[PDB]
Design a protein around this ligand. Structure first.
Ligand SMILES: [Zn+2]
Length: 866
């Protein structure tokens, strides 16, 4: 498999302006007829090079003339000696039932559906499968009426008819030119939830949610979220929907989360289906964010698309930023920001420290499906957020407006977007652009000095990004570094110098820089990198008392949580080192007291309290360490939970009881109290056994919603309580028929602290609710084990690696994209001790030698073994 390079971009020799597709649909043999209107832009002697994968070519015509000047080569059909303008007609066959990779046209249960991003359309017909080729699509679908009563594609129905032998057809037209990655087709039998949204300017939009028969009871929340998204994009960004119908189809077999196909989104059912007894608060909020995300792509992705796949973050960074803003505006901004920072620090930083490290705009790609990443998405959003920080909302929106004005109806680049922001705002972003081209996490080091003679406070700030495997050269970035200074009373000290106010967002642009503030009347306690103003590691020599002061006094809820994280970090590091020396947990009294104060503070938002009382995950803890000891980390996490459970037992029970809610509402105040109640339950599960066992089993049995039932079940597993096996069995017996609900149980099994966890996981490969054919099941059992139980995955006998090798040997052939998701924990080998590295290296070498090794895995394995 050959690497492709951003610097090699060249405008296409041919454009296609219009494509008329006909599908004669059948699960075993689908016949595709594609009539494209082409225009040569390149040299008159250039051939037309069409991409295609696993196609049975039937015929090639040019202006209805059977063509003789063509040849098929690996991944391509090369057509020679063409006119400047012509009609290309390709007929080919494909087999949806054989498509286990779930890219192109495939089968999901009894339905047929597509996934075309990034390069799936070439698995359907021979085409210019590159996103800078935009064409107007018409799509005719012919199928068995009984099997496929609904035949959907992008846009509007323009024709329909019936045929002999029980077949029928529907033709769709989408007036907006699009790259083929936004093509979609769905055929099947569905229940349909129908609603309307009327745009601000009065366009009535038909909303249609297609779900498997029997699932209508689980559709209203997704529909509500769609309308919420539509309204918010109008209010916040001034953007309205641009078509007459909006369709969403929920499918059970889907590699990603969801897909923004123009006017016909296709969603993993996980991000659509919810009812109070099947879905948790987190599920509801995830459905809201993913529904919003795909909706927001209508402008940031569809109306303006990507020139090439190296520009993926142009749509993903910006659309993730949009989904975060949507969630934050509608819900708790603090909780959203906290959660997104947990993801950055605990998951994205790990990626940026790995062999797969890449800039948010990659320079080199072998398999583009490998670049739908935490970096491109979440760090992408952090980069957009930094622009927002530097410009402010008003200028940021002017930049959005200029971006659309310039680029609506076209395929654009990351650089185009930055230019629009720069031009609209008059803020210089030339240095800022380096964020697009440099990988790795910057480390920002802060030293301070207070001079009582001059009443001046000085911050000496330095930055460096360690080299990464992809980049030997690193340079200083333009880092927006937000600060606040607090006096002894917790009042904010005005920032000023030389008689003029100074903006609280400092421009840290050099390797080392000095910032001086005057009229600092009292030695300040600083809050640094406020609201995580840049995606960086902060090094500052905090005292415990500075941190607890901030937990008490910081103006932004995020700063209070972040201070708690810095406080915990010190003692997590302390206790991991202790664990390695065979010593038990040590925690100063004043640290437990800080958390007691959070529990007993009447004024604190329950949403914030819940997050402060949620310990960093084992993945967040791992990133505190150069060399990861996953067993020490897991055992310290448990020990810390137990210590706090004991020290805070009375306060935890008081707050647990006080936050009881007899009514279940998916409303933000209710969610906050429930999140706090369940955060308390976590610790209580680790209290005196009988007490804990009664409390947990009672909650599981009395729960009137899945959030509370799952919190109890999770606690029983985490604390290995007596009731665990009974509750797990009850859940299986009640829910085995429901894959999405069973995913929660597979995750619990996979992440169990039980000594026999791997044995149980292996056994579950035969479970009635498990199947290797379904990405969700695979990720919930195998993915969760390898990625979310690093203590068990990294068992010293190497049994975890061997298990993953077995699974990947299957998935490499079945579904390379899911295989590539699942190999990620193995490619982190250099973060581990030498004994583990050698076993992980051995595992990787076994995979490297697989017959028919997918490009997806080849790319990761080669980087990991380098
Ligand atoms: Zn997206």
């Amino acid at each position: 498999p050959q690497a492709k390079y951003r610097h090699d971009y060249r405008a296409p020799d041919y454009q296609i302006t219009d494509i008329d597709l006909t599908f004669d649909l059948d699960a075993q043999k689908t016949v595709v007829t594609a009539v494209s209107q082409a225009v040569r832009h390149g040299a008159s002697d250039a051939p037309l090079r069409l991409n295609g994968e696993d196609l049975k070519l039937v015929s090639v015509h040019i202006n209805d003339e059977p063509w003789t000047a063509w040849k098929e080569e690996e991944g391509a059909l090369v057509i020679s000696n063409l006119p400047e303008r012509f009609t290309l007609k390709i007929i080919n066959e494909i087999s949806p039932a054989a498509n286990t990779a779930l890219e192109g046209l495939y089968q999901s249960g009894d339905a047929l559906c597509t996934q075309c991003e990034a390069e799936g359309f070439r698995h359907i017909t021979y085409y210019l499968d590159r996103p800078d080729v935009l064409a107007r699509f018409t799509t005719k679908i012919i199928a068995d009426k009984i099997k496929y009563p609904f035949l959907l594609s992008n846009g509007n129905r323009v024709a329909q008819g019936e045929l002999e032998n029980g077949r029928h057809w529907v033709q769709w037209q989408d007036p907006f030119p699009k790259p083929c990655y936004l093509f979609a087709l769905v055929a099947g039998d569905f229940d349909v939830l129908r609603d309307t949204f009327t745009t601000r300017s009065g366009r009535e939009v038909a909303l249609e949610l297609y779900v498997d028969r029997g699932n209508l009871d689980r559709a209203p929340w997704a529909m509500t979220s769609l309308k919420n998204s539509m309204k918010w994009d109008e209010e916040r960004f001034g953007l309205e929907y641009d078509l007459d119908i909006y369709m969403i189809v929920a499918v059970d077999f889907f590699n990603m989360g969801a897909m923004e196909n123009k006017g016909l989104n296709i969603f993993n059912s996980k991000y659509v289906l919810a009812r109070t007894d099947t879905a948790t608060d987190k599920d509801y909020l995830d459905i809201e964010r993913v529904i919003g995300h795909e909706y927001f792509h209508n402008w940031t992705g569809n109306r303006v698309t990507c020139r090439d796949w190296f520009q993926l973050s142009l749509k993903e960074g910006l659309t993730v930023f949009r989904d975060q803003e949507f969630s934050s505006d509608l819900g708790s901004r603090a909780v959203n920001r906290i959660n997104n920072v947990r993801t950055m620090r605990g998951l994205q930083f790990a990626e940026d420290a790995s062999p797969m490290a890449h800039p948010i705009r990659p320079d080199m790609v072998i398999e583009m499906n490998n670049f739908y990443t935490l970096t491109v998405y979440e760090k992408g959003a952090e980069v957009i957020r930094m622009i927002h920080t530097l410009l402010g909302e008003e200028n940021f929106q002017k930049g959005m407006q200029l971006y659309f004005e310039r680029h609506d109806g076209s395929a654009a680049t990351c650089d185009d977007f930055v230019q629009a922001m720069e031009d609209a705002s008059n803020v210089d972003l030339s240095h800022f652009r380096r964020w697009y081209s440099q990988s790795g996490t910057p480390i920002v080091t802060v030293k301070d000095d207070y001079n009582p003679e001059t009443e001046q406070y000085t911050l000496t700030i330095s930055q460096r990004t360690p080299a990464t495997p992809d980049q030997a050269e690193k340079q200083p970035l333009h880092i927006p570094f937000a600060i606040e200074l607090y006096d002894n009373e917790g009042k904010v000290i005005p920032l000023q110098k030389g008689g003029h106010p100074v903006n609280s967002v400092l421009n840290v642009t050099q390797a080392e820089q000095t910032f001086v503030f005057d009229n600092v009347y009292f030695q300040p306690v600083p809050a640094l990198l406020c609201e995580f103003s840049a995606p960086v590691k902060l090094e500052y020599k905090w005292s415990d008392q500075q941190l607890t002061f901030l937990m008490r006094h910081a103006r932004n809820d995020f700063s209070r949580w972040d201070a708690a994280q810095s406080l915990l970090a010190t003692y997590i590091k302390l206790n991991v080192a202790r664990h390695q020396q065979g010593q038990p947990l040590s925690l100063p009294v004043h640290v437990a007291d800080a958390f007691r104060a959070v529990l007993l503070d009447e004024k604190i938002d329950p949403a914030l309290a819940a997050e402060i009382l949620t310990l960093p995950s084992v993945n967040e803890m791992a990133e505190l360490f150069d060399i990861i000891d996953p067993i020490a980390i897991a055992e310290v996490r448990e020990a810390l939970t137990r210590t706090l459970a004991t020290e805070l037992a009375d306060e935890l029970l008081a707050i647990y009881n006080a936050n009881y809610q007899s009514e279940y509402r998916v409303e933000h105040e209710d969610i906050a109290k429930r999140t706090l109640r369940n955060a308390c339950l976590r610790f209580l599960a680790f209290g005196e056994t009988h007490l804990a066992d009664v409390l947990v089993s009672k909650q599981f049995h009395e729960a009137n919603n899945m959030t509370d039932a799952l919190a109890a079940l999770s606690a029983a597993v985490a604390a290995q309580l007596p009731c665990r096996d009974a509750l797990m069995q009850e859940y299986d017996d009640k829910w085995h028929q429901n894959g999405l609900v069973m995913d929660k149980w597979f995750i619990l099994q996979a992440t169990s602290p039980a000594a026999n966890v791997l044995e149980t996981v292996r056994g579950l490969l035969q479970h009635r609710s498990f199947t290797m054919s379904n990405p969700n099941r695979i990720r919930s059992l195998i993915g969760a084990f390898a990625g979310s139980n690093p203590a068990a995955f990294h068992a010293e006998d190497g049994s975890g690696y061997l298990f993953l090798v077995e699974m990947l040997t299957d998935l490499n052939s079945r579904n390379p994209q899911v295989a590539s998701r699942l190999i990620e924990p193995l490619i982190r080998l250099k973060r581990y001790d030498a004994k583990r590295q050698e076993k992980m290296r051995a595992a990787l070498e076994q995979l490297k030698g697989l017959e028919n090794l997918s490009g997806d895995l080849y790319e990761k394995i080669t980087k990991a073994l380098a």
